[PDB]
Amino acid sequence: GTMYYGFDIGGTKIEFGAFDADLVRVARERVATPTESYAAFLDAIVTLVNNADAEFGVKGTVGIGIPGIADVETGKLLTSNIPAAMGHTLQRDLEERLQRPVKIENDANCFALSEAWDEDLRGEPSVLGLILGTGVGGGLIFNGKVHSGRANIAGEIGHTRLPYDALKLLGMENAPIFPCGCKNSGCIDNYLSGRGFEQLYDHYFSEKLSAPEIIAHYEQGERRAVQHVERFMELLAICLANIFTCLDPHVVVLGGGLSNFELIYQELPKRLPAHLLHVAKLPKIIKARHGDAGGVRGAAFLNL
C-alpha cells in the first residue's frame, strides 16, 4: 500500500523512480527538463506523480533531488543549472498541486542517503557520503535520515579550510593556497576533489595533467606521479582525520570520478591512525555502489 517516488532534476533530464515497501525499484521514467517555462516544469513532475499513482493504485510519497538547495526560509530554489525553476517555491507549488507533502534535498544528500540504504549499510547509526569530483560534496546520514542543517547546507565539508596539519604537510607559508569558487580561500574543495588532485599535481610538478593521466603514470612507476600520489594520500588522510575527529562516522562512502582510484581504499586505513585520536577506530570506507541510480534512490528515500 506504500510507494516512494524519487525525482532527480538535471539541467536537461528529469529522472523518475518508484520504489515499493521493500525499496525495490518498480518504475523508471525519464523526461526532458523544460529549459525556460516554470509552468511546464511543474507539469512534468505533477504528470509523472499522477500517472504513477494511477498505475500503482496508491498515493506515493514525493522526494526531489536538485543541484542546489531550497532556501530554508523562503522556499525559493537556488539552482543555477535549472533556469526554469530558479527562484521558484517548488515545494509549496508541488504540495498545492499534489495535495501531499513534498521533500526537496541537495543531490549530494540524496547520494549519501541512497548509499546508506544499501542492504549492507542499513542499520548503520551514521553514514558520511563524499563525492570527489570537480568539487567535494558531502551528505550526513544519521539513523537512515538526512541531516539537512539549519540552512539546508549541512555536509558542505568542501568549504572548510585546510587544517594546520595539512598546511604543514604542504609547506606551511609556502603551501599552495587555492582560491575557491565560494570566494573564501584554501577550502578543501580545491584539494581533495578530482580537480584538487590535478591542481596539486600541477602546482608541484609544473605540468597540467588530468587525474587519469597522473594515475596511469603512477601505475608505470613514474617518479613525479609517485611523489604526487604519496603527498595526495597523506593530505587526504590528514583532512579526513580532522573531519572524522568531529563526526566519527561509522561508514564513509566515496563517489565521483576520484572514487574510482582504488588505491584510496588501501592507503586511507594505513594513514588515518597517525592523525586520529589514540582511542579512535577506523570507519568502514567504501566506494559508492549505486552510481547513476543514486539521485532517484536518495530522493525517494527521503520519505522512508
Q: Which residues bind a copy of itself (CB under 8 A)?
A: 69, 71-73, 78, 125-126, 138, 140, 142-143, 145, 147-157, 159-167, 172-173, 177, 182-186, 242-243, 245-250, 275, 277-283
Nearer to Zn ion, 44 or 157 (CB): 157
From 17-25, 60-68, 188-196, 263-271, span contacting Cl ion (CB under 5 A) = 17-25
60 labeled binding residue:
no
What is the Cα–Cα distance from 273 to 285, expressed in whole angstroms? 14
Q: Give yes or no for a contact between 254 and 130, defined as CB atoms under 8 angstroms apart.
A: yes
Q: Output the smallest distance, CB 160 to Zn ion, in A.
A: 8
Choose the one of a copy of itself, Cl ion, Zn ion, none that binds residue 25, judging by a C-beta under 5 to 8 angstroms depending on kind: Cl ion
- Does 27 engage in binding with Cl ion (CB under 5 A)? no
| Residue 295: φ, ψ to 5° | -60, -50
Rounded (5°) CA angle 196-299-86: 70
Q: Single out the residue of 163, 105, 159 nearest to residue 137, CA to CA.
A: 159
What is the sign, positive or negative, of the torsion defined by CA atoms of 94, 97, 98, 101?
Answer: positive
Q: In terms of CB distance, is 183 or 223 closer to a copy of itself?
A: 183
Q: Could you say which residues in the range 281-300 bind Cl ion, by CB under 5 A?
A: 293
Q: Work out how close the CB of 25 gets to Cl ion at its nearest, in angstroms, rounded to a whole number.
A: 4
- Strand arrangement of the beta sheet that strand 251-255 belongs to: 145-146, 136-142, 126-132, 251-255, 284-287
User: Residues with Cβ < 8 Å from 174, sequence gap 6 or more?
Assistant: none
Q: Which CB sits closer to a copy of itself, 195 or 275?
A: 275
Give the one residue of 10, 25, 180, 284 binding Cl ion; rule: CB under 5 A.
25
Burial 127-145 (b: 16+ CB within 10 A, else e): bbbbbbeebbbbbbbbebe
H-run or E-run covering 13: strand 13-19
Strands 251-255 and 136-142, how do they pair? Answer: unpaired
Among residues 74 and 184, whose Cβ is nearest to Zn ion?
184
137 is in an annotated binding site: yes
- Residue 293 binding target from Cl ion, a copy of itself, Zn ion, none, CB below 5 to 8 Å by type: Cl ion
Smallest gap from Cβ 190 to a copy of itself, in A, equals 11
**CB of 272 vs a copy of itself, minimal distance in Å:** 12
Considering the complex, state which of residue 182 and residue 216 has its C-beta at the smaller distance from Zn ion. 182
- Residue 104 or 235: the one with the smaller Cβ distance to Zn ion is 235
120-159 binders of Zn ion (CB under 5 A): 159
Q: Where are the alpha helices (DSSP H) in 28-123?
A: 38-56, 90-98, 107-116
Q: What is the SS3 string spanning 224-272?
A: HHHHHHHHHHHHHHHHHHHHHHHHCCCEEEEECHHHHCCHHHHHHHHHH
Known binding residue 194? Answer is: no
Pull the grid cell for residue 74: 523562503
Nearer to a copy of itself among residue 133 and residue 163 (C-beta):
163
Our finding on whether 180 is near Zn ion (CB under 5 A) is yes
Binding site per annotation, positions for N-acetyl-alpha-D-glucosamine: 68, 80, 106-107, 156, 159, 189
Q: For binding to Cl ion (CB under 5 A), which residues are involved?
A: 25, 293
Binding site per annotation, positions for ATP: 6-13, 135-142
Binding site per annotation, positions for ADP: 12-13, 134, 198, 257
